[PDB]
Each structure stands twice: as C-alpha cells, then as structure tokens.
C-alpha cells in the first residue's frame, strides 16, 4: 500500500546566468505505517526535496501522487487547503507563536473543524500526557526549556492524525538526553498510532531509530538499508559502515 509515489522529479534554481540544478531524476516509494529517513550531507537537496514532496515548492518536471491524488495539477489554493488538512510538519527551529500558551498552541489546527469543547479538551490531554507536558498547559513558551518546546511542537503536529508527517532534523537544537528522549517518544508514537513519518537528517544516531534509510548524494538516491530483526546498535554499526564508503 503505497502512500507517496514520485517519478523522475527535477528542480532548478535561478535563471539565465545562474541556473543550477538540484534534483536530477529521483524515484521515491513510501508505504503506509513506515518510518523512513533520508540521510545525506549538508550540500545535498534534503530541504528542497522535503519542500517539493509536501507541495510547498514547485517541481520543474516529474509527477507526485500522494494518497492517490495527482498534486501536479492543483494551482495554489487547492495545494494550501490540502496541506492544511492532510499533512503535519515539524521543523528544527521556531514553531510556536510567542503570544499563546502550550494548550492554545497545540489546539490551533483543530479550530478549522469546530470539534465541540469536550471533544477537543479530551484529545488535548490524551496527547499531552503521552509527552509529559500536561503540567505545562498554562505556561508561555518563554518559561519552558528547549526540549519541552520541541515536545509541544510534536504534540501539535500529531494531534490531527495526518496522512504523512514531514520532520526536518527535529533534534538539531537539543543536547544528548533531550534528543534521545524526543526520538524515543517519536518512535513510540509511531508504533502506537500508525503514522507515516518522513525525516531528513545528517546524524547516524538519529537515523538508527528508523526502519529504512535512503542515502542521497547530489540529488540521486543509490543505497537502501533495511533494519529487520537487528537491534539499534547493530543497525547503527551498519549505517556507520555504509556512510564510510560514500565519503572515501
């Protein structure tokens, strides 16, 4: 059961004298309930790929099919309304509005639907107690630590149970303990409620929590690893071994 499907997508920046090509013929096949990671260096088109896969940017060529709907024909407003309802986003950086509390920040996407009052106050607590922020419900974002804001952002992204969740280096601003805690909670949330997460990283430690790793280099995918029955340590060692060949 494929959820996302791309066929030979391309993308370029600039014009005339500074027209550079970033993506060159990429094929992607993500399934339902999978937790996939694309790993590459800092010059590879990871953010560009995540932008064009979620309809934030526009491809020069190719075709993208999310959940059976062709997204190369919607103009702008259909794409925005599709993003508003069916997708979730987590970013490495500022996600929370400074003038709202935690509750009013992670109850924002539910305002489109008008899901009563108790039908929203129950779904808020059900996801808040799963991340340990239920005692931080009436605190402004300038009164909480670094990892608590990221957990709050993840709770906001998971509340309306979208089809695909796009994460761009979620643990790029946390120390070791906070990063490990957030990654473990993300994995548990994935396993409990079946959700497809596509994450782009440049850290093998954060990529060892996944189930399939795709190695990108200059807009071309050429390696795939599958976890299988191995635990986290063996998968981490295998990822380290694979990363050593593409760099030497």
């Amino acid at each position: 059961h494929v959820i996302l499907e791309a066929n030979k997508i391309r993308k370029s920046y600039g014009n005339k004298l500074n027209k550079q090509e970033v993506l060159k013929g990429i094929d992607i096949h993500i399934e339902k309930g999978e937790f996939v990671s694309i790993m590459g260096a800092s010059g590879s088109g990871k953010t560009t790929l995540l932008n064009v896969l979620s309809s934030i940017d526009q491809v020069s060529h190719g075709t993208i099919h999310i959940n059976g709907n062709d997204m190369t024909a919607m103009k702008e407003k259909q794409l925005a309304e599709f993003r508003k309802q069916h997708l979730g986003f987590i970013f490495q950086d500022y996600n929370l509005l400074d003038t709202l509390t935690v509750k009013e920040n992670i109850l924002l996407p539910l305002s489109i639907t008008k899901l009563s009052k108790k039908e929203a106050n129950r779904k808020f607590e059900e996801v808040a107690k799963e991340l340990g922020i239920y005692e931080l419900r009436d605190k402004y974002p300038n009164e909480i630590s670094g990892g608590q804001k990221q957990r709050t952002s993840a709770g906001r992204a998971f509340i309306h149970d979208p089809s695909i969740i796009f994460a761009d280096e979620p643990t790029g601003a946390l120390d070791s303990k906070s990063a490990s805690d957030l990654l473990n909670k993300l994995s548990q949330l994935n396993q409990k409620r079946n959700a497809t997460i596509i994450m782009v990283t440049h850290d093998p430690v954060a990529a060892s929590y996944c189930g399939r790793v795709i190695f990108i280099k200059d807009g071309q995918m050429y390696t795939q690893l599958n976890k299988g029955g191995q635990d986290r340590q063996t998968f981490f060692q295998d990822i380290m071994k694979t990363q050593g060949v593409l760099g030497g």
Binding site: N15, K217, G247
Partner: protein, 334 residues
C-alpha cells in the same frame, strides 16, 4: 513606456484640459470675472492633475511590462498577479493556452511511449519465429544446402541482433552490470554461434589467452567480440584468426589478428563512423557498417577503448583495452 501610456490615455487628458481652456476663454468675455483670479485656479488644477497622472502611471504600467518581459526571453513565470478585471481576463487566456500546450506535450509523450511499446511487441513477435525456424531446420541431412541455409540464418540473426543493440543503446546505461567472467567459455560460445561461416570459409580459431578474466558486462562485450569476429571473417578468406589476451601494464587487452585484405590507411579512423562502408570492394555494399559503431559506443560507458591497426593486404587488428580494476568503484560514491 512613457509614450505608450501617454498615447493610450489621450482622450482623458484632452477632456481634462478642455475645461481649463473653456474657463480661460470665457474669462475674457465676462466683465464680472477677472482673468488674474482665474489663472490661479487654472494653475492649482494643473498641478494636481500632473501629480495624479504621475501616481497613476506607476500603478498602471506594471502588468503589461511584466508581460513584455515574459514575451520571449526567459522566465516563463515572469507574469505578475492581476488586480484589475482587464488584467484578469488576459491571464485567463494565457493560462488556458499554457495548459493546452502542456496537455498536447503530454499527448506527444504518451504517443512516443505507445510507439515504443508497440515496436517492442513487434520485436518479440519477429524474434520468436527466427528461433522457431532455426529449431525446425536443425535437422537437415545435406551438406551444401545446409551450409547455405545456416549462412543465411546467421546473417539474418546478426542483422537482427545489431538492430536490437541499436534500439537498446538508449537503455544500455541502466543495463551495465559487473561480474566475474571467463573469456574461454564466451569465446567458445561465439565460435559455436559462428560455426557455419568459418566452416564454409575454412577459417580456424586460435585461443591463447594469458588472462581469461575481464572486467566488463557480459552481453555488451560478447556483442563487441562477436562483431569483431564477424568483421574479421568477412575481411579474411581461408585464414586463421588469432585471439590472444595479454596484460598491457595495468590495463587488460584482448588482441585479434587476421590475414585478410585489410583496411586502407585513408579510412582506418572512419571504420567506426556511423553507417560507414568501404567503396574499395563491390561486395561491401551489403554491409551497413553498424557493428563497429555500436561496439565502440557500448565500450565508452565501460571505459574500454578499441584500438585498430589495419594495413591493406595484411589484415585488421582490433584491441579492447580494458580499464584498470581501481576505476570501477566510482558508481557508488560519485
């Protein structure tokens, strides 16, 4: 830009100035109205009119300038966002024509794909009965008739295989595969495939290979060697072909020799040209000259160069200079 705006909105300017001209003229023939006190009104009106025109020009001459920029140069998305209805009922037509062009291009692509699929099906349908015919006629009891039929069948098979390679040159890039291959089995298989021609021409085969292991794709290298052998057989009559492989330093090479008529030095570099043929001999009109070109092109992605040393009255020598072992490792990193 200024002149276009001024010439387009000329009726409005004329209408605006007509009232001031009328006031100035009327002030003369009216004793109760003074000229000096109406020239002040005229001045105060003309100042505001100039300011209003300057304000309107910048706002109005933007969408059409963007369209002029979009005309032919580049930046197909140079159009701006329309605001007035007249600028919307133009973008409507522009978008309609663009979408029609895009769907026509998609239709052309689908037609090309359908043609490729149909011609692949035809290739399968015309490759089935060559094999059926060969299997049926692999029962014959006479000598000369069997030799003639086998020669004709081998010629047709070679032509169809060359055509198939000519068509598969598009996807040869994706079909490159590296695995350990022994030269002796493939050479013996090629000799078996070319038994009838060598039997008729009395052409022997010599296999003295110092190194029997090569680093290249099986199918494409087999095509190259088969084409070289067929060219040598055509160019050499009643002569034995020497096949030797030796290690030229760090590059493995395979050498083929013959005692044929050879190639004139004036056209040695031109044998690998597309569709090239030799005008020296009358019987060369039946050769399309496609095996050499296809083999050389297929050897390029494998980092293999074909060396030719042919002399008229001596024969034709072909060398496949296989690359260094350390060079087939960049497909995973770069």
């Amino acid at each position: 830009m200024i002149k276009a705006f001024l010439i387009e909105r000329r009726s409005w300017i004329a209408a605006f100035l007509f009232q001031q001209a009328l006031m100035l003229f009327i002030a003369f023939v009216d004793p109760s109205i003074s000229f000096g006190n109406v020239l002040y009104m005229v001045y105060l009106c003309i100042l505001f009119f100039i300011i209003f025109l300057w304000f309107r020009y910048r706002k109005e001459t933007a969408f059409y300038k963007s369209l002029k920029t979009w005309e032919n140069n580049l930046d197909v998305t140079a159009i701006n966002e329309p605001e007035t209805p007249f600028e919307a009922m133009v973008e409507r037509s522009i978008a309609g024509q663009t979408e029609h062009l895009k769907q026509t291009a998609a239709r052309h692509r689908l037609a090309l794909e359908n043609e490729k699929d149909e011609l692949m099906a035809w290739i399968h349908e015309v490759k089935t009965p060559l094999t059926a015919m060969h299997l049926i006629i692999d029962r014959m009891e006479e000598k000369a008739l069997k030799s003639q039929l086998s020669y004709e069948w081998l010629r047709i098979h070679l032509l169809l295989d060359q055509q198939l390679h000519q068509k598969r040159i598009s996807f040869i890039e994706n079909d490159l595969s590296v695995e350990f291959i022994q030269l002796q089995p493939l050479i013996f298989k090629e000799i078996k495939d070319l038994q009838s021609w060598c039997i008729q021409k009395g052409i022997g085969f010599d296999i003295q290979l110092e190194a029997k292991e090569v680093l290249s794709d099986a199918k494409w290298l087999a095509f190259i060697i088969r084409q070289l052998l067929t060219n040598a057989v055509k160019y050499s009559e009643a002569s034995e072909i020497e096949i030797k492989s030796f290690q030229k330093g760090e590059q493995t090479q395979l050498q083929v020799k013959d005692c044929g008529r050879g190639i004139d030095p004036k056209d040695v570099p031109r044998i690998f040209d597309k569709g090239f043929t030799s005008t020296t001999d009358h019987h060369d009109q039946a050769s399309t000259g496609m095996g050499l070109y296809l083999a050389k092109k297929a050897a390029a992605p494998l980092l293999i160069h074909i060396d030719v040393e042919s002399e008229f009255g001596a024969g034709t020598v072909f060398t496949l200079t296989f690359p260094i072992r350390n060079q087939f490792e960049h497909v995973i990193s770069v």
